[PDB]
Design a protein around this ligand. Structure first.
Ligand SMILES: [Zn+2]
Ligand SMILES: [Zn+2]
Ligand SMILES: [Zn+2]
Lengths: 36, 36, 36
């Protein structure tokens, strides 16, 4: 299913970008603890 | 290689889902420190 | 665009692998705090 694969890849991209931002948010909190 | 691309995309999905759960597990530990 | 989808999937893979390593790096720092 070609069109379904295109959409799956786009969802792939969205989920990774959301995880990158969630990792940055946790890094901010961890750094506050590390330098507190 | 069409069939190889389908499988690569499925592995893609599995790895992201595993990373999302690993991020949740680290968030739990960080929150315990933040509110300790 | 078949060739563009192949490349997008490869970028997908690279970004997940980079995020896995970033999560490991944050886990190392969190563990230092947790056992400090
Ligand atoms: Zn630091
Ligand atoms: Zn908190
Ligand atoms: Zn620990």
């Amino acid at each position: 299913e070609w069109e379904a694969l295109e959409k799956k890849l786009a969802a792939x991209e969205s989920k990774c970008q959301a995880l990158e931002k969630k990792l940055q948010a946790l890094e901010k909190k961890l750094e506050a603890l590390e330098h507190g």
